[PDB]
Amino acid sequence: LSTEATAKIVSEFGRDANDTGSTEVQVALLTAQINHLQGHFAEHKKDHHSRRGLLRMVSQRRKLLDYLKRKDVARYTQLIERLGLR
RNA sequence: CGGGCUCAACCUGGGAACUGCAUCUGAUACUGGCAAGCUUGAGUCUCGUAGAGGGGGGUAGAAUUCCAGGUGUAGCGGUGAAAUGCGUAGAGAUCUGGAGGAAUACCGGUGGCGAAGGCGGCCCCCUGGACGAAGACUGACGCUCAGGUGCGAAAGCGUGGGGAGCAAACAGGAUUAGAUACCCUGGUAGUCCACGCCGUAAACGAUGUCGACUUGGAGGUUGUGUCUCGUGGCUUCCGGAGCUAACG
RNA sequence: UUGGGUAACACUAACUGGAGGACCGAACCGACUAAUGUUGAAAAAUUAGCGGAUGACUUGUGGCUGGGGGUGAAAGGCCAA
RNA sequence: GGCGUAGUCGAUGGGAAACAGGUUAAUAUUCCUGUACUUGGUGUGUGGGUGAUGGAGGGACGGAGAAGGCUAUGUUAUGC
RNA sequence: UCGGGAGAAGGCACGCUGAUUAGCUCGCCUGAUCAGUCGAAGAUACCAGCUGGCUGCAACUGUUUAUUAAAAACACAGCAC
RNA sequence: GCCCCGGUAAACGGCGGCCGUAACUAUAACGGUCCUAAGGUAGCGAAAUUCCUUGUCGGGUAAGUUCCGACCUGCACGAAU
């Protein structure tokens, strides 16, 4: 994942200015990384190592979302709607 | 504690502590719940660093063997010593050429890296971790972590391929009182490649991880610095206090 | 295929789909045990049972290969009773 | 007596064209009645180009599962 | 070989009659409810697995003596030279 | 081409006998001694492939030359005969 490709995805999801660590922001990076990793599965069916690496990349997201929907349900439906998870 | 049956066991009277639970009231520092709010943490960001870290493909040289040619002697090979064996239609030794398989000098190191297993002839691609500086960011989003999940030498196993060398089992020659050992001549699986599986081990530094704290000296790897020295991380040795049954 | 748990590997539930020289069978196929029959129509049939049953199946017509032959998943089996 | 080319032969399969009705002691989508259709030849008219052999659709429309439409008939109706 | 084995096994109900409910557009379609009631027997008249255990052999379907043996015989995918 | 030597047993095959140690007795087990080189350890074995053998121990049964398990010197069982 390129630098600008990461700094741009954080801005489009950033709640406010300079927003780097947020529920909707974090999940954004994770989702992205997951998309690239999942696509990495379509090929190299042998890469069992990186396979494990996703269990967490998502367990974090699945936990962040669980935390989001738990506190604010509005920010939830909006987040998923923007990304496209579930 | 006192008293009663001659004592005691036993028993009586009184007293105290008396947990636990119900009711009412109060405090509320700490834990919990709700609401709001700061950076020196963790993580992250920016700029840099060392390395045999992992996966795929390609590639070089030396050596062993086989095949072809030349030459060529009478032996060569091999051992503690020999023999089997190979050789005058020409082995060995030697030169040239070709094919194939496996692992890969000087540098390598007492070095370095990876989470571990492991990983260095070299090159490229893909990908994990960690360290230093600026101290900027989120703003504590931390640490650990039953279960779960993945990884995990070698050996061995399934299918296909390959197979130079080496080599369990195995076929012989020696040694020996006997050797179904060591030594020697052959030799299958395997050792190798692709894929699937097993999941174990001195998987050992045999001292799980994280943070704080406690004299220093010396050698080495790496970043930075006002670099005959200061400082951060890593790898050894000797050691203060202290710790240990002892070794340490 | 859908839904759910999971990162994935995959798993579970439901649904769909329905293969399989598979099982029961219409028509029928095969045919172990006995009796009848045994100068039966004659070149081997009847009865009571019994077993297996969409395929490498069954069948009509036409055509091809012949004797020491061919053929034969070899039984010395078959090649016009 | 046998192996390639040109020709031909080989399955009432393939194969251009009609049904309905009536009639005989015995026959028929062949007789009769009505109607339809095909091929070949010629031409009155319309119309104003008439063609082996290989190749095209076509005939090889094959196997398995199956929806829907659907006939007369039958039936509900003891309707006509 | 989780495909299966399994209509395993085992047990109950299953008649008629009256009045109704549900599914569907409807059926002279289907699934049920309540009450009454007769026989020894209600799938009372048309088919039709008996079940279970141990052991020998071959794997199985299939093939084989058209006229006495289909059997542990033959073949078969697979493995090897 | 063959005699020559060597390789090959998924080549036709061969695998007898004896003593000691040791047990209450018999056998198995181990080594040797001899013959013809080895003499058999995986499994499993008197098994449809062993005479002797209705072999020995035993299950099971009132009893079973049947069968199953074990031992097993394997007359003339044993490796894709």
Q: Is there contact between A58 and strand C, defined as CB under 7 Å from any strand atom? A: yes
| Cβ contact A66 with chain C strand, < 7 A | no
CA A63 to chain CA mean position, Å: 11
List the determination method.
Answer: cryo-EM
Nearest-nucleotide field for A56 (CA, C1'): C7
Distance between CA atoms of A61 and A37, rounded to whole angstroms? Answer: 15
User: Phi and psi dihedrals of A68, rounded to 5?
Assistant: -65, -60
d(CA A73, CA A60): 18
State, as a whole number of angstroms, the distance between the CA of A48 and the C1' of B85.
Answer: 54
A51 touches strand C (CB under 7 A): yes
Q: Which residue has the tokens 């801005």?
A: A11
**Overall size of chain A counted in residues:** 86
For residue A47, CA distances in Å to A53, A71, A81 come to: 11, 37, 31
Q: Which of A16, A69, A4 lies closest to A27 in space, CA to CA?
A: A69
Measured distance CA(A4)–CA(A46) in Å, rounded: 30
Q: How far is CA A15 from the centre of its chain?
A: 15
The Cα-based distances of A35 to A18, A24, A40, A70, A85 in angstroms read 25, 16, 8, 25, 10
Dig out the tokens for A18 from the structure. 């300079």
Distances (CA, A) of A24 to A28, A32, A60: 6, 12, 12
| Rounded Cα distance, A49 and A38, in Å | 13
Give the whole-angstrom CA distance, residue A27 versus residue A3: 17
